[PDB]
Amino acid sequence: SVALVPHVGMGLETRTETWMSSEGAWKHAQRIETWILRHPGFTIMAAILAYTIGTTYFQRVLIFILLTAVTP
Amino acid sequence: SVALVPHVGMGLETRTETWMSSEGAWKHAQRIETWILRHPGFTIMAAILAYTIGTTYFQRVLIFILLTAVTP
Amino acid sequence: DVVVLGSQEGAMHTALTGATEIQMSSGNLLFTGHLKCRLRMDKLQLKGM
Amino acid sequence: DVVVLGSQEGAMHTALTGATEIQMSSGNLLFTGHLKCRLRMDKLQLKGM
């Protein structure tokens, strides 16, 4: 629906706070942290995949934080 | 809000179709394809990053499809 | 200043996608879900031989 | 069977986060945004020397 495409980096800014006033950013971060906290097994699976593919340390950290962020 | 955490892989299935009946999946795919189609420059930036870091071909393809999917 | 955020009924429905629905007007009328019988059948003619 | 999906006013507001808001009751009363003047000042005493 209009649950997503939440008009973020479109441009059009100004000096003043726009709609949610730095609450949507913390909303996004807290809900993905909450979803990680509820489902630890997928986090462990993502960590194992990060350790298997890549194998240079920076690539591992990158794809691990990405597979934590791939949730819809 | 409740725009996300859309009760997906929780379990609890049955023989019958649940709520949106295979429309939410195509919803997700079509909106991320639409967002790629509107913003080509970030896709080019993600492709350049995929070519720079990683550098084994499978890792490149993986992190490219991930950075297309990292959008909220 | 204060701002009501509005009805989230649509956002609620978009949240509870992927969940089975149910009519509940008369107490309950619960649907789709399974159960497990063990079946014993001695006690059975063939409606006459 | 048919199902109304409900009001998406909350989902609408969650969509238009990151966008500037505006009061619009009397025609328009548009706010936050910038403009660019060039300023010429000859034509100016110091309120009397």
Side-chain angles (χ1 to χ4, degrees), chain A residues 1-12 14-16 18-22 24-32 34-72, chain B residues 1-12 14-16 18-22 24-30 32 34-72, chain C residues 2-8 10-20 22-41 43-48, chain D residues 2-8 10-20 22-41 43-49:
Chain A
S1 68
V2 296
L4 288 92
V5 192
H7 191 76
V8 280
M10 294 299 171
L12 279 69
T14 182
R15 184 57 58 88
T16 71
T18 62
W19 176 247
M20 291 302 290
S21 296
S22 70
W26 289 90
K27 182 185 289 291
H28 181 79
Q30 285 180 357
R31 68 169 177 84
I32 62 97
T34 299
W35 182 75
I36 290 171
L37 189 144
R38 296 295 184 185
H39 297 171
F42 180 70
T43 301
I44 299 301
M45 185 62 71
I48 292 170
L49 288 175
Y51 181 73
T52 53
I53 199 67
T55 65
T56 174
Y57 62 97
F58 182 74
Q59 193 69 39
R60 295 183 176 176
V61 174
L62 179 63
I63 66 173
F64 176 71
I65 195 66
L66 263 55
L67 267 77
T68 59
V70 291
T71 176
Chain B
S1 68
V2 296
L4 288 92
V5 192
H7 191 76
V8 280
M10 294 298 171
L12 279 69
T14 182
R15 184 57 58 88
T16 71
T18 62
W19 176 247
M20 291 302 290
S21 296
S22 70
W26 289 90
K27 182 185 289 291
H28 181 79
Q30 285 180 357
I32 62 97
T34 299
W35 182 75
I36 290 170
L37 189 144
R38 296 295 184 185
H39 297 171
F42 180 70
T43 301
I44 299 300
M45 185 62 71
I48 292 170
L49 288 175
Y51 181 73
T52 53
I53 199 67
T55 65
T56 174
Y57 62 97
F58 182 74
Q59 193 69 39
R60 295 183 176 176
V61 174
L62 179 63
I63 66 173
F64 176 71
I65 195 66
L66 263 55
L67 267 77
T68 59
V70 291
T71 176
Chain C
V2 305
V3 166
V4 284
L5 199 65
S7 298
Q8 284 84 18
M12 169 192 163
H13 296 172
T14 311
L16 48 78
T17 184
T20 174
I22 184 55
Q23 177 181 4
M24 184 172 174
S25 178
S26 178
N28 191 358
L29 292 173
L30 188 59
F31 282 162
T32 73
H34 69 280
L35 72 101
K36 182 173 88 273
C37 300
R38 188 168 185 182
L39 181 69
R40 293 179 180 178
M41 284 185 177
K43 294 180 179 180
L44 268 82
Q45 301 295 321
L46 288 167
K47 195 174 173 64
Chain D
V2 305
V3 166
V4 284
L5 199 65
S7 298
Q8 284 84 18
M12 169 192 163
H13 296 172
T14 311
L16 48 78
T17 184
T20 175
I22 184 55
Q23 177 181 4
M24 184 172 174
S25 178
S26 178
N28 191 358
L29 292 173
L30 188 59
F31 282 162
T32 73
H34 69 280
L35 73 101
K36 182 173 89 273
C37 300
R38 188 168 185 182
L39 181 69
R40 293 179 181 178
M41 284 185 177
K43 294 180 179 180
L44 268 82
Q45 301 295 321
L46 288 167
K47 195 174 173 64
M49 186 69 198

